[PDB]
Amino acid sequence: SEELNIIQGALELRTKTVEDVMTPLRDCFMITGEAILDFNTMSEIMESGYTRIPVFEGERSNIVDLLFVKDLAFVDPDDCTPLKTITKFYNHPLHFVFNDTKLDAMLEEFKKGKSHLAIVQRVNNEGEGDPFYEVLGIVTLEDVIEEIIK
C-alpha cells in the first residue's frame, strides 16, 4: 500500500536532483532585511505558518540569512527593531548546493546538519563576463520527504 510507494521514492532518491523538487525562487516566501518588526509585520510573519523564512537584501536572488519564527521570542513591537538586527542576534547556518546534487546526498546532509533548508544554485558558462552562481530555488527536507512518501 504505502510501502511500495515509499520504496519507489527511496530508490528514486539516487536519480532525482535537488532541482526537481525545489520550490523555485519565484514562489518561495521571503522577507527583506529592511523589514521593520512592528506589530503588523511580526503578526504577518507569524500568521504565515512558516517556521523559517529566507531573508534577502536588495533583489530576492541575494539571500543573506534565515529568520526563524522563534527568533522573535522577546522582541518588542513598540521598539520597531529592524529585522537585520534580529538576524544578527541568531546563528542559523545557510547551506547552498548545486542543481546536480542527488536527493539521497541532500537527505544525508539534512540528517547531519542543524539547517533543514538549502539554496539551489547553478553555474552558467554563457556570458560576456565572469561565470557566476545563479540561485534557482530552495529545497527543504520537507520537499525530499514529500518526494519519498508522495
Binding site: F98, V123, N125, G127, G129, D130, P131, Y133
Partner: protein
C-alpha cells in the same frame, strides 16, 4: 561563495570574493587565517583599502576586463610579484579576488601554478575541484593557448 586556499611548491594563494565595507573585518580575520600578506584586486572598487593595509596586508588594484584574459603586462607583473613576495616571506600566502572568484582571479592563480610546474589539465582540474565551474570559454581559450616559461 567563500574563500579557497591553493598551495603548490611553497606557493599559496587565496581565491576570494569582493567584500563589502561592513564584511571587511571578518574578511581580514579570514585573510590572516590563511596568512596572506598581500591581496590583488581584479574587480572594481566597492570599498576602501586603508584599514586592510593598517592590519598589515598591502592592496594592489590591477583591474582588467571582466570575463576576459589578462594582458601580458599584468601577467609579467603578476609573476614578478609572486617571485618577490614568496622569496621575501616563504610559506606565506597572497590573495587574489574577482567579484566571487570565478574567472579572472582563478585565471591568475592558474598561470601561477602553470608556471610553477603543474600541467594545464592538472591545474584546471585542481582549481575546479576547489570551486566548481571556475572558468568560462574566453578564459579556457587563454589558459589553453598560454605558453609557460618555467619562471
Amino acid at each position: 561563495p567563500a574563500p579557497v586556499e591553493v598551495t603548490y611548491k611553497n606557493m599559496r594563494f587565496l581565491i576570494t570574493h569582493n567584500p563589502t565595507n561592513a564584511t571587511l573585518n571578518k574578511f581580514i580575520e579570514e585573510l590572516k587565517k590563511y596568512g596572506v600578506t598581500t591581496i590583488v584586486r581584479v574587480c572594481e572598487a566597492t570599498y576602501d583599502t586603508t584599514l586592510v593595509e593598517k592590519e598589515g596586508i598591502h592592496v594592489l588594484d590591477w583591474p582588467f576586463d571582466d570575463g576576459a584574459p589578462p594582458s601580458n603586462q599584468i601577467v609579467d607583473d603578476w609573476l614578478s610579484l609572486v617571485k618577490i613576495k614568496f622569496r621575501e616571506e616563504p610559506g606565506c600566502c597572497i590573495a587574489v579576488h574577482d567579484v566571487a572568484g570565478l574567472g579572472r582571479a582563478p585565471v591568475l592563480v592558474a598561470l601561477a601554478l602553470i608556471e610553477g610546474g603543474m600541467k594545464y589539465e592538472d591545474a584546471v582540474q585542481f582549481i575546479r575541484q576547489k570551486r566548481r565551474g571556475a572558468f568560462n570559454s574566453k578564459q579556457l581559450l587563454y589558459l589553453e593557448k598560454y605558453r609557460p616559461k618555467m619562471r
